[PDB]
Nucleic acid binder design. Structure first.
Ligand SMILES: [Ca+2]
Length: 579
DNA sequence: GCGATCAGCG
DNA sequence: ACGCTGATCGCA
Protein backbone atom coordinates (compact mmCIF):
# COMPACT_ATOMS: atom_id res chain seq x y z
CA UNK A 1 0.00 0.00 0.00
CA UNK A 2 3.06 2.27 -0.31
CA UNK A 3 5.13 2.33 -3.46
CA UNK A 4 8.89 1.84 -3.24
CA UNK A 5 11.77 0.36 -5.21
CA UNK A 6 13.11 -2.80 -3.54
CA UNK A 7 16.55 -2.23 -4.98
CA UNK A 8 19.34 -4.71 -5.66
CA UNK A 9 22.07 -2.11 -6.21
CA UNK A 10 22.58 1.52 -5.30
CA UNK A 11 21.80 3.98 -8.10
CA UNK A 12 22.69 7.62 -8.49
CA UNK A 13 19.20 8.86 -7.55
CA UNK A 14 19.45 7.21 -4.11
CA UNK A 15 22.28 9.65 -3.35
CA UNK A 16 20.47 13.02 -3.49
CA UNK A 17 21.86 15.72 -1.21
CA UNK A 18 18.74 15.60 0.98
CA UNK A 19 17.07 12.42 2.18
CA UNK A 20 15.15 10.63 4.88
CA UNK A 21 17.22 7.70 6.04
CA UNK A 22 16.40 4.67 8.13
CA UNK A 23 19.24 2.35 9.16
CA UNK A 24 17.32 -0.20 11.17
CA UNK A 25 18.93 -1.78 14.22
CA UNK A 26 16.34 -3.88 16.02
CA UNK A 27 18.39 -4.87 19.05
CA UNK A 28 17.74 -2.65 22.07
CA UNK A 29 21.50 -2.37 22.71
CA UNK A 30 22.84 -1.33 19.33
CA UNK A 31 26.52 -1.87 20.13
CA UNK A 32 27.86 -4.30 17.56
CA UNK A 33 24.34 -5.09 16.51
CA UNK A 34 23.02 -6.27 13.14
CA UNK A 35 21.70 -3.70 10.70
CA UNK A 36 18.65 -5.42 9.24
CA UNK A 37 17.55 -3.09 6.45
CA UNK A 38 17.97 0.37 5.01
CA UNK A 39 15.44 2.87 3.67
CA UNK A 40 15.94 6.12 1.77
CA UNK A 41 13.28 8.63 0.78
CA UNK A 42 14.08 11.66 -1.32
CA UNK A 43 12.72 13.74 -4.20
CA UNK A 44 13.37 10.85 -6.63
CA UNK A 45 11.50 8.15 -4.77
CA UNK A 46 11.45 5.64 -1.96
CA UNK A 47 14.10 2.93 -1.89
CA UNK A 48 14.83 -0.08 0.28
CA UNK A 49 18.36 -1.49 0.30
CA UNK A 50 19.64 -4.67 1.78
CA UNK A 51 22.53 -3.76 4.09
CA UNK A 52 24.84 -6.41 2.56
CA UNK A 53 25.08 -4.61 -0.76
CA UNK A 54 24.48 -1.02 0.42
CA UNK A 55 27.20 -1.07 3.09
CA UNK A 56 29.67 -2.73 0.65
CA UNK A 57 28.94 -0.28 -2.16
CA UNK A 58 31.55 2.52 -2.04
CA UNK A 59 29.32 5.32 -3.42
CA UNK A 60 26.68 4.71 -0.74
CA UNK A 61 29.28 4.54 2.03
CA UNK A 62 30.75 7.81 0.77
CA UNK A 63 27.26 9.29 0.73
CA UNK A 64 26.71 8.26 4.38
CA UNK A 65 29.97 9.98 5.40
CA UNK A 66 29.45 13.13 3.40
CA UNK A 67 28.41 15.99 5.66
CA UNK A 68 27.03 17.91 2.64
CA UNK A 69 24.51 15.09 2.07
CA UNK A 70 21.80 15.99 4.56
CA UNK A 71 19.91 13.14 6.21
CA UNK A 72 16.73 13.26 8.26
CA UNK A 73 16.47 10.40 10.71
CA UNK A 74 14.88 9.07 13.85
CA UNK A 75 17.41 8.20 16.61
CA UNK A 76 20.50 8.96 14.56
CA UNK A 77 22.83 7.95 17.42
CA UNK A 78 21.54 4.35 17.23
CA UNK A 79 22.38 4.27 13.53
CA UNK A 80 25.67 6.14 13.88
CA UNK A 81 26.96 3.80 16.58
CA UNK A 82 25.92 0.56 14.86
CA UNK A 83 27.61 1.81 11.66
CA UNK A 84 30.83 2.70 13.52
CA UNK A 85 30.90 -0.95 14.61
CA UNK A 86 30.82 -1.82 10.88
CA UNK A 87 33.63 0.71 10.36
CA UNK A 88 31.38 3.21 8.50
CA UNK A 89 30.93 6.91 9.37
CA UNK A 90 27.56 8.70 9.43
CA UNK A 91 27.72 12.48 8.97
CA UNK A 92 25.33 15.10 7.70
CA UNK A 93 22.33 14.38 9.95
CA UNK A 94 20.40 17.64 10.05
CA UNK A 95 17.12 16.44 11.54
CA UNK A 96 16.53 13.82 14.21
CA UNK A 97 12.82 13.26 14.77
CA UNK A 98 13.41 11.62 18.14
CA UNK A 99 15.21 14.60 19.62
CA UNK A 100 12.62 16.90 18.04
CA UNK A 101 9.77 15.00 19.68
CA UNK A 102 11.59 14.89 23.01
CA UNK A 103 12.08 18.67 23.03
CA UNK A 104 8.42 19.34 22.20
CA UNK A 105 7.13 17.12 24.98
CA UNK A 106 9.36 14.77 27.00
CA UNK A 107 6.36 13.12 28.69
CA UNK A 108 5.24 11.54 25.38
CA UNK A 109 7.73 8.71 25.85
CA UNK A 110 8.37 8.73 22.11
CA UNK A 111 9.91 5.32 21.49
CA UNK A 112 9.51 5.02 17.70
CA UNK A 113 8.53 6.95 14.59
CA UNK A 114 4.84 6.06 14.95
CA UNK A 115 4.61 7.62 18.42
CA UNK A 116 6.21 10.85 17.17
CA UNK A 117 4.07 10.85 14.02
CA UNK A 118 0.94 10.71 16.20
CA UNK A 119 1.84 14.09 17.74
CA UNK A 120 1.20 15.49 14.22
CA UNK A 121 -1.81 13.28 13.31
CA UNK A 122 0.37 11.18 10.98
CA UNK A 123 -0.46 7.48 11.06
CA UNK A 124 0.65 5.87 7.79
CA UNK A 125 3.31 3.96 9.76
CA UNK A 126 3.16 1.07 12.22
CA UNK A 127 4.57 0.92 15.77
CA UNK A 128 7.89 -0.89 15.82
CA UNK A 129 6.37 -3.33 18.32
CA UNK A 130 3.50 -4.26 16.01
CA UNK A 131 6.05 -5.22 13.36
CA UNK A 132 8.76 -6.97 15.36
CA UNK A 133 6.70 -8.33 18.27
CA UNK A 134 7.77 -8.37 21.91
CA UNK A 135 9.86 -10.64 24.10
CA UNK A 136 10.57 -14.18 22.89
CA UNK A 137 8.37 -13.67 19.82
CA UNK A 138 10.54 -10.75 18.61
CA UNK A 139 11.68 -11.28 15.04
CA UNK A 140 12.71 -9.52 11.86
CA UNK A 141 9.65 -10.13 9.64
CA UNK A 142 9.77 -11.29 6.03
CA UNK A 143 11.73 -8.89 3.81
CA UNK A 144 8.67 -7.43 1.97
CA UNK A 145 7.06 -6.67 5.37
CA UNK A 146 10.35 -5.29 6.74
CA UNK A 147 10.97 -3.10 3.69
CA UNK A 148 7.52 -1.47 3.80
CA UNK A 149 7.91 -0.69 7.50
CA UNK A 150 11.32 0.95 7.00
CA UNK A 151 10.09 2.83 3.92
CA UNK A 152 7.00 3.98 5.86
CA UNK A 153 9.24 5.16 8.68
CA UNK A 154 11.36 7.11 6.21
CA UNK A 155 8.32 8.55 4.42
CA UNK A 156 7.07 9.72 7.83
CA UNK A 157 10.39 11.37 8.68
CA UNK A 158 10.41 13.00 5.24
CA UNK A 159 6.95 14.49 5.84
CA UNK A 160 7.30 15.35 9.55
CA UNK A 161 10.50 17.43 9.55
CA UNK A 162 8.63 20.56 8.49
CA UNK A 163 5.78 20.59 11.05
CA UNK A 164 8.22 19.58 13.81
CA UNK A 165 10.64 22.40 12.98
CA UNK A 166 7.85 24.96 12.92
CA UNK A 167 6.53 23.99 16.33
CA UNK A 168 10.10 23.99 17.67
CA UNK A 169 10.52 27.51 16.31
CA UNK A 170 7.27 28.69 17.94
CA UNK A 171 8.54 27.17 21.21
CA UNK A 172 11.99 28.84 20.80
CA UNK A 173 13.40 25.28 20.84
CA UNK A 174 14.89 25.22 17.31
CA UNK A 175 18.48 26.27 18.03
CA UNK A 176 18.16 23.96 21.03
CA UNK A 177 17.67 21.05 18.58
CA UNK A 178 20.05 22.05 15.79
CA UNK A 179 22.88 23.61 17.82
CA UNK A 180 22.72 21.63 21.09
CA UNK A 181 20.98 18.24 21.02
CA UNK A 182 21.88 17.12 17.50
CA UNK A 183 25.61 18.01 17.82
CA UNK A 184 25.61 16.41 21.26
CA UNK A 185 24.16 13.29 19.66
CA UNK A 186 27.28 12.89 17.47
CA UNK A 187 29.49 13.40 20.52
CA UNK A 188 27.69 10.77 22.62
CA UNK A 189 27.99 8.34 19.70
CA UNK A 190 31.75 8.85 19.77
CA UNK A 191 31.88 8.41 23.54
CA UNK A 192 29.72 5.25 23.46
CA UNK A 193 31.77 3.73 20.67
CA UNK A 194 35.11 4.62 22.26
CA UNK A 195 34.06 2.88 25.47
CA UNK A 196 35.94 2.74 28.77
CA UNK A 197 38.66 0.18 29.38
CA UNK A 198 38.21 -1.92 32.51
CA UNK A 199 40.85 -3.81 34.52
CA UNK A 200 39.06 -7.12 34.93
CA UNK A 201 41.88 -8.53 37.05
CA UNK A 202 41.34 -5.83 39.68
CA UNK A 203 37.55 -6.32 39.49
CA UNK A 204 37.58 -10.15 39.58
CA UNK A 205 39.95 -9.83 42.54
CA UNK A 206 37.70 -7.50 44.57
CA UNK A 207 34.83 -9.93 44.05
CA UNK A 208 36.70 -12.76 45.76
CA UNK A 209 37.56 -10.43 48.63
CA UNK A 210 33.87 -9.52 48.86
CA UNK A 211 32.63 -13.11 48.83
CA UNK A 212 34.81 -13.71 51.90
CA UNK A 213 33.57 -10.59 53.67
CA UNK A 214 29.91 -11.35 52.80
CA UNK A 215 29.93 -14.67 54.65
CA UNK A 216 31.51 -13.22 57.80
CA UNK A 217 28.82 -10.57 58.33
CA UNK A 218 26.31 -13.12 57.02
CA UNK A 219 27.18 -15.51 59.86
CA UNK A 220 27.21 -12.71 62.43
CA UNK A 221 23.68 -11.82 61.25
CA UNK A 222 22.47 -15.40 61.74
CA UNK A 223 24.09 -15.50 65.17
CA UNK A 224 22.74 -12.07 66.19
CA UNK A 225 19.32 -13.13 64.91
CA UNK A 226 19.76 -16.40 66.85
CA UNK A 227 18.77 -18.21 63.63
CA UNK A 228 19.34 -18.22 59.90
CA UNK A 229 16.99 -16.84 57.27
CA UNK A 230 16.93 -15.20 53.85
CA UNK A 231 18.47 -11.83 54.68
CA UNK A 232 17.35 -10.45 51.30
CA UNK A 233 13.73 -11.61 51.87
CA UNK A 234 11.70 -8.71 53.29
CA UNK A 235 9.18 -11.33 54.44
CA UNK A 236 11.68 -13.14 56.68
CA UNK A 237 13.73 -10.06 57.56
CA UNK A 238 10.58 -8.21 58.54
CA UNK A 239 9.61 -11.15 60.75
CA UNK A 240 13.07 -11.25 62.31
CA UNK A 241 13.34 -7.55 63.13
CA UNK A 242 9.80 -6.61 64.13
CA UNK A 243 8.41 -9.94 65.36
CA UNK A 244 11.29 -12.14 66.58
CA UNK A 245 13.48 -9.33 67.96
CA UNK A 246 10.35 -7.15 68.32
CA UNK A 247 12.08 -3.97 67.19
CA UNK A 248 9.93 -0.84 66.88
CA UNK A 249 8.04 -0.36 63.63
CA UNK A 250 8.91 3.09 62.29
CA UNK A 251 7.43 2.80 58.75
CA UNK A 252 5.39 0.46 56.59
CA UNK A 253 5.22 -0.13 52.87
CA UNK A 254 2.23 -1.18 50.81
CA UNK A 255 3.35 -4.80 51.35
CA UNK A 256 4.64 -4.71 54.93
CA UNK A 257 7.46 -3.67 57.23
CA UNK A 258 9.83 -1.19 55.68
CA UNK A 259 13.51 -2.10 56.03
CA UNK A 260 15.07 0.85 54.20
CA UNK A 261 18.42 2.14 55.42
CA UNK A 262 16.91 5.25 57.04
CA UNK A 263 14.81 2.88 59.16
CA UNK A 264 17.70 0.56 60.02
CA UNK A 265 19.71 3.63 60.97
CA UNK A 266 17.12 4.70 63.55
CA UNK A 267 17.09 1.16 65.01
CA UNK A 268 20.83 0.97 65.70
CA UNK A 269 20.35 1.94 69.39
CA UNK A 270 17.96 -0.98 69.79
CA UNK A 271 20.07 -3.85 68.48
CA UNK A 272 23.35 -4.64 66.75
CA UNK A 273 21.87 -6.75 63.95
CA UNK A 274 20.62 -3.65 62.09
CA UNK A 275 24.10 -2.27 61.46
CA UNK A 276 25.28 -5.67 60.19
CA UNK A 277 22.35 -5.94 57.83
CA UNK A 278 23.37 -2.53 56.45
CA UNK A 279 26.94 -3.72 55.95
CA UNK A 280 25.63 -6.92 54.33
CA UNK A 281 23.45 -5.03 51.83
CA UNK A 282 26.25 -2.62 50.94
CA UNK A 283 28.67 -5.46 50.19
CA UNK A 284 25.94 -7.28 48.27
CA UNK A 285 25.24 -4.20 46.15
CA UNK A 286 28.92 -3.90 45.19
CA UNK A 287 28.96 -7.62 44.41
CA UNK A 288 25.71 -7.76 42.44
CA UNK A 289 25.74 -4.56 40.43
CA UNK A 290 29.33 -3.36 40.15
CA UNK A 291 31.47 -6.52 40.19
CA UNK A 292 29.25 -9.17 38.61
CA UNK A 293 27.21 -6.64 36.63
CA UNK A 294 30.27 -4.93 35.15
CA UNK A 295 32.05 -8.20 34.34
CA UNK A 296 28.97 -9.37 32.39
CA UNK A 297 29.11 -6.53 29.87
CA UNK A 298 32.87 -6.16 29.32
CA UNK A 299 33.76 -7.11 25.77
CA UNK A 300 36.49 -9.67 26.43
CA UNK A 301 38.57 -8.94 23.32
CA UNK A 302 39.08 -5.23 24.17
CA UNK A 303 38.19 -5.20 27.91
CA UNK A 304 35.89 -2.26 27.14
CA UNK A 305 32.39 -1.54 28.44
CA UNK A 306 30.17 0.43 26.03
CA UNK A 307 27.41 2.32 27.82
CA UNK A 308 24.35 3.75 26.02
CA UNK A 309 23.70 7.39 26.89
CA UNK A 310 19.92 7.90 26.55
CA UNK A 311 19.38 11.43 25.28
CA UNK A 312 15.55 11.44 25.06
CA UNK A 313 14.43 9.88 28.38
CA UNK A 314 14.70 12.13 31.44
CA UNK A 315 11.93 14.66 31.97
CA UNK A 316 14.50 17.38 32.79
CA UNK A 317 17.00 17.07 29.93
CA UNK A 318 19.58 15.11 31.89
CA UNK A 319 21.19 12.15 30.24
CA UNK A 320 20.90 8.68 31.65
CA UNK A 321 23.33 5.78 31.15
CA UNK A 322 22.26 2.18 30.55
CA UNK A 323 23.96 -1.26 30.53
CA UNK A 324 26.19 -0.62 32.27
CA UNK A 325 24.98 2.52 34.08
CA UNK A 326 28.23 4.48 34.29
CA UNK A 327 26.64 7.44 36.06
CA UNK A 328 26.26 5.73 39.45
CA UNK A 329 29.63 4.07 40.04
CA UNK A 330 30.32 4.09 43.80
CA UNK A 331 32.30 6.99 45.25
CA UNK A 332 30.85 7.85 48.67
CA UNK A 333 32.13 5.02 50.90
CA UNK A 334 35.74 4.00 50.61
CA UNK A 335 35.15 0.27 50.04
CA UNK A 336 32.92 0.98 47.05
CA UNK A 337 34.98 3.86 45.70
CA UNK A 338 37.74 1.33 44.96
CA UNK A 339 35.66 -0.02 42.06
CA UNK A 340 36.84 3.11 40.22
CA UNK A 341 40.38 1.71 40.20
CA UNK A 342 39.25 -0.76 37.56
CA UNK A 343 38.43 2.10 35.17
CA UNK A 344 41.70 2.67 33.35
CA UNK A 345 42.79 4.56 30.24
CA UNK A 346 42.47 2.72 26.96
CA UNK A 347 46.09 3.13 25.79
CA UNK A 348 49.45 2.93 27.51
CA UNK A 349 50.89 6.22 28.79
CA UNK A 350 47.42 7.80 28.83
CA UNK A 351 45.64 9.26 31.83
CA UNK A 352 42.05 9.85 32.95
CA UNK A 353 41.03 13.52 33.36
CA UNK A 354 37.88 14.44 35.34
CA UNK A 355 36.31 17.92 35.49
CA UNK A 356 33.08 18.87 37.26
CA UNK A 357 30.97 21.90 38.14
CA UNK A 358 30.80 22.90 41.80
CA UNK A 359 27.22 23.30 43.13
CA UNK A 360 25.89 23.94 39.65
CA UNK A 361 22.21 24.03 40.59
CA UNK A 362 22.54 26.56 43.40
CA UNK A 363 24.50 28.78 41.00
CA UNK A 364 21.79 28.38 38.37
CA UNK A 365 19.17 29.12 41.02
CA UNK A 366 21.03 32.18 42.22
CA UNK A 367 21.07 33.48 38.64
CA UNK A 368 17.40 32.67 37.90
CA UNK A 369 16.05 33.82 41.27
CA UNK A 370 18.43 36.82 41.23
CA UNK A 371 18.59 36.39 45.00
CA UNK A 372 21.00 39.05 46.32
CA UNK A 373 22.48 36.96 49.13
CA UNK A 374 22.80 33.75 47.10
CA UNK A 375 24.48 35.64 44.26
CA UNK A 376 26.82 37.33 46.73
CA UNK A 377 27.65 33.94 48.26
CA UNK A 378 28.79 32.56 44.91
CA UNK A 379 30.61 35.74 43.91
CA UNK A 380 32.66 35.06 47.06
CA UNK A 381 33.14 31.41 45.99
CA UNK A 382 31.56 30.29 49.26
CA UNK A 383 30.99 26.55 49.76
CA UNK A 384 27.34 26.67 50.74
CA UNK A 385 27.33 23.04 51.82
CA UNK A 386 30.14 23.52 54.34
CA UNK A 387 28.68 26.81 55.59
CA UNK A 388 25.35 25.00 55.97
CA UNK A 389 27.02 22.11 57.79
CA UNK A 390 28.50 24.62 60.26
CA UNK A 391 25.11 26.24 60.92
CA UNK A 392 23.48 22.81 61.39
CA UNK A 393 25.91 20.99 63.66
CA UNK A 394 27.12 24.22 65.35
CA UNK A 395 30.71 23.25 64.50
CA UNK A 396 33.40 25.28 62.75
CA UNK A 397 34.71 24.89 59.22
CA UNK A 398 37.74 22.86 60.30
CA UNK A 399 35.41 20.39 62.02
CA UNK A 400 33.00 19.64 59.16
CA UNK A 401 33.20 15.97 58.06
CA UNK A 402 32.27 14.68 54.57
CA UNK A 403 29.40 12.95 56.38
CA UNK A 404 28.26 16.31 57.74
CA UNK A 405 28.58 17.96 54.33
CA UNK A 406 26.58 15.24 52.56
CA UNK A 407 23.69 15.86 54.95
CA UNK A 408 23.93 19.65 54.61
CA UNK A 409 23.92 19.19 50.83
CA UNK A 410 20.59 17.37 51.02
CA UNK A 411 19.29 20.16 53.27
CA UNK A 412 20.27 22.82 50.70
CA UNK A 413 18.59 21.17 47.74
CA UNK A 414 15.67 19.87 49.82
CA UNK A 415 14.71 23.30 51.11
CA UNK A 416 14.82 25.00 47.73
CA UNK A 417 12.94 22.08 46.14
CA UNK A 418 10.20 22.08 48.76
CA UNK A 419 11.12 19.66 51.57
CA UNK A 420 8.62 19.89 54.41
CA UNK A 421 9.38 20.38 58.09
CA UNK A 422 8.40 16.74 58.52
CA UNK A 423 10.91 15.45 55.99
CA UNK A 424 13.65 17.76 57.23
CA UNK A 425 13.01 16.71 60.84
CA UNK A 426 13.45 13.07 59.84
CA UNK A 427 16.65 13.82 57.95
CA UNK A 428 18.31 15.85 60.67
CA UNK A 429 16.70 13.88 63.52
CA UNK A 430 15.41 17.06 65.11
CA UNK A 431 12.05 18.29 66.28
CA UNK A 432 9.38 19.25 63.79
CA UNK A 433 9.25 22.80 65.16
CA UNK A 434 13.03 23.20 64.97
CA UNK A 435 12.87 22.02 61.34
CA UNK A 436 10.17 24.55 60.49
CA UNK A 437 12.12 27.28 62.27
CA UNK A 438 15.29 26.32 60.43
CA UNK A 439 13.39 26.49 57.12
CA UNK A 440 11.79 29.89 57.79
CA UNK A 441 15.21 31.19 58.85
CA UNK A 442 16.81 29.84 55.65
CA UNK A 443 14.23 31.78 53.65
CA UNK A 444 14.99 34.88 55.75
CA UNK A 445 18.52 34.90 54.32
CA UNK A 446 17.36 33.99 50.79
CA UNK A 447 13.98 35.70 50.26
CA UNK A 448 14.61 35.87 46.52
CA UNK A 449 14.66 32.09 46.39
CA UNK A 450 11.30 32.07 48.17
CA UNK A 451 9.79 34.56 45.72
CA UNK A 452 11.19 32.46 42.91
CA UNK A 453 9.57 29.25 44.19
CA UNK A 454 6.24 31.09 44.46
CA UNK A 455 6.53 32.79 41.08
CA UNK A 456 7.52 29.70 39.16
CA UNK A 457 4.62 27.70 40.60
CA UNK A 458 2.24 30.48 39.57
CA UNK A 459 3.84 30.75 36.14
CA UNK A 460 3.40 26.98 35.63
CA UNK A 461 -0.34 27.34 36.46
CA UNK A 462 -0.79 30.14 33.96
CA UNK A 463 1.35 28.73 31.14
CA UNK A 464 0.86 25.01 31.66
CA UNK A 465 4.60 24.30 31.61
CA UNK A 466 8.01 25.38 32.88
CA UNK A 467 11.07 26.09 30.76
CA UNK A 468 14.86 26.11 31.22
CA UNK A 469 17.46 28.70 30.30
CA UNK A 470 17.90 27.24 26.81
CA UNK A 471 14.12 26.75 26.48
CA UNK A 472 13.76 23.08 27.27
CA UNK A 473 10.12 22.57 28.26
CA UNK A 474 8.18 20.30 30.59
CA UNK A 475 4.39 20.33 30.71
CA UNK A 476 2.83 20.15 34.19
CA UNK A 477 -0.91 19.39 33.74
CA UNK A 478 -1.17 18.25 37.40
CA UNK A 479 -0.21 21.73 38.60
CA UNK A 480 -3.97 22.50 38.62
CA UNK A 481 -5.27 19.12 39.80
CA UNK A 482 -7.82 19.30 42.59
CA UNK A 483 -6.16 16.32 44.32
CA UNK A 484 -3.81 17.78 46.92
CA UNK A 485 -1.14 15.09 46.66
CA UNK A 486 -1.04 15.19 42.87
CA UNK A 487 -0.87 18.98 42.74
CA UNK A 488 1.89 19.12 45.34
CA UNK A 489 4.12 16.73 43.39
CA UNK A 490 3.58 18.97 40.36
CA UNK A 491 4.46 22.17 42.24
CA UNK A 492 7.72 20.64 43.38
CA UNK A 493 8.41 19.74 39.75
CA UNK A 494 7.90 23.38 38.87
CA UNK A 495 10.53 24.37 41.44
CA UNK A 496 13.04 21.73 40.42
CA UNK A 497 12.81 21.18 36.66
CA UNK A 498 13.92 24.65 35.43
CA UNK A 499 16.95 24.46 37.73
CA UNK A 500 18.09 20.88 37.11
CA UNK A 501 17.17 21.18 33.44
CA UNK A 502 19.22 24.35 33.08
CA UNK A 503 22.19 22.58 34.65
CA UNK A 504 21.77 19.85 32.04
CA UNK A 505 21.63 22.52 29.29
CA UNK A 506 24.91 24.08 30.53
CA UNK A 507 26.88 20.81 30.68
CA UNK A 508 25.58 19.86 27.22
CA UNK A 509 26.85 23.11 25.75
CA UNK A 510 30.11 22.52 27.60
CA UNK A 511 30.59 19.16 25.84
CA UNK A 512 29.94 20.65 22.40
CA UNK A 513 32.31 23.58 22.99
CA UNK A 514 34.91 21.24 24.50
CA UNK A 515 34.89 18.95 21.44
CA UNK A 516 35.39 21.98 19.18
CA UNK A 517 38.25 23.26 21.31
CA UNK A 518 39.89 19.83 21.38
CA UNK A 519 39.72 19.64 17.58
CA UNK A 520 41.20 23.02 16.82
CA UNK A 521 44.04 22.42 19.33
CA UNK A 522 44.55 19.01 17.61
CA UNK A 523 44.68 17.08 20.88
CA UNK A 524 44.01 13.33 20.98
CA UNK A 525 42.12 13.90 24.24
CA UNK A 526 38.52 12.73 23.94
CA UNK A 527 35.44 12.43 26.12
CA UNK A 528 34.53 9.13 27.76
CA UNK A 529 31.68 9.86 30.20
CA UNK A 530 29.34 12.56 31.33
CA UNK A 531 27.98 12.27 34.90
CA UNK A 532 25.35 15.09 35.06
CA UNK A 533 27.79 17.87 36.02
CA UNK A 534 31.06 16.06 35.37
CA UNK A 535 33.07 15.28 32.26
CA UNK A 536 35.59 12.46 32.10
CA UNK A 537 38.17 12.33 29.32
CA UNK A 538 41.18 10.22 28.54
CA UNK A 539 44.29 11.63 26.89
CA UNK A 540 48.02 11.02 26.38
CA UNK A 541 49.83 12.06 29.57
CA UNK A 542 51.69 14.77 27.69
CA UNK A 543 48.35 16.52 27.06
CA UNK A 544 47.51 16.78 30.78
CA UNK A 545 49.02 20.22 31.41
CA UNK A 546 47.22 21.74 28.44
CA UNK A 547 43.95 20.07 29.50
CA UNK A 548 44.22 21.58 32.99
CA UNK A 549 43.84 24.98 31.37
CA UNK A 550 41.58 24.10 28.47
CA UNK A 551 38.79 22.02 30.03
CA UNK A 552 38.20 24.25 33.10
CA UNK A 553 38.02 27.29 30.89
CA UNK A 554 35.63 25.74 28.34
CA UNK A 555 33.27 24.55 31.07
CA UNK A 556 33.39 27.88 32.95
CA UNK A 557 32.60 29.81 29.76
CA UNK A 558 29.82 27.60 28.44
CA UNK A 559 27.18 30.14 29.49
CA UNK A 560 27.48 33.53 31.17
CA UNK A 561 25.49 33.86 34.37
CA UNK A 562 25.21 36.59 36.97
CA UNK A 563 27.50 34.49 39.17
CA UNK A 564 30.65 32.66 38.05
CA UNK A 565 30.75 28.99 37.26
CA UNK A 566 33.39 27.04 39.18
CA UNK A 567 35.02 23.89 37.83
CA UNK A 568 37.29 21.49 39.67
CA UNK A 569 39.51 18.99 37.92
CA UNK A 570 41.86 16.10 38.61
CA UNK A 571 43.77 13.54 36.59
CA UNK A 572 45.42 10.21 37.28
CA UNK A 573 46.16 6.64 36.30
CA UNK A 574 42.57 5.52 36.98
CA UNK A 575 39.16 7.06 37.45
CA UNK A 576 39.72 6.52 41.18
CA UNK A 577 42.88 8.64 41.10
CA UNK A 578 41.12 11.37 39.09
CA UNK A 579 39.70 13.16 42.14
C1' DG B 1 6.56 -7.16 35.77
C1' DC B 2 6.66 -4.36 40.10
C1' DG B 3 8.22 -2.02 43.95
C1' DA B 4 11.41 -1.66 47.67
C1' DT B 5 15.95 -0.67 47.98
C1' DC B 6 20.25 1.68 47.10
C1' DA B 7 24.09 3.35 43.79
C1' DG B 8 24.86 8.22 41.67
C1' DC B 9 23.95 13.45 40.45
C1' DG B 10 21.69 17.80 41.94
C1' DA C 1 5.82 15.17 53.20
C1' DC C 2 12.95 17.79 48.12
C1' DG C 3 14.06 16.10 42.38
C1' DC C 4 16.26 13.15 38.41
C1' DT C 5 17.87 8.45 37.30
C1' DG C 6 19.04 2.49 36.52
C1' DA C 7 20.15 -2.33 38.39
C1' DT C 8 19.05 -5.95 41.28
C1' DC C 9 16.02 -9.07 43.44
C1' DG C 10 12.12 -11.21 45.98
C1' DC C 11 7.55 -11.50 45.25
C1' DA C 12 4.02 -9.81 51.17
CA1 LIG D 1 30.14 18.41 41.42
Amino acid sequence: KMAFTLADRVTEEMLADKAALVVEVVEENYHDAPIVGIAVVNEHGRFFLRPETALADPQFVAWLGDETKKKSMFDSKRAAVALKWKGIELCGVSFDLLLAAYLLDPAQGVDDVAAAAKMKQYEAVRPDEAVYGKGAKRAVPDEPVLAEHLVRKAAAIWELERPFLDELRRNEQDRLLVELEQPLSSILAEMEFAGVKVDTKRLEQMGKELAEQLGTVEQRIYELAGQEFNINSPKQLGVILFEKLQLPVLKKTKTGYSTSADVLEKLAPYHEIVENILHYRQLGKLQSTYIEGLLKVVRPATKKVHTIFNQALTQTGRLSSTEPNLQNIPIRLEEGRKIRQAFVPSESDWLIFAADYSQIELRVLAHIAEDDNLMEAFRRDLDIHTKTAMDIFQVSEDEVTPNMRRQAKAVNYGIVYGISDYGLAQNLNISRKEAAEFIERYFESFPGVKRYMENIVQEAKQKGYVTTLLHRRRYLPDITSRNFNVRSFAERMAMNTPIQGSAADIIKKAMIDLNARLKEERLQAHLLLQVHDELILEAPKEEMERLCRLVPEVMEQAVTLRVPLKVDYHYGSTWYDAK
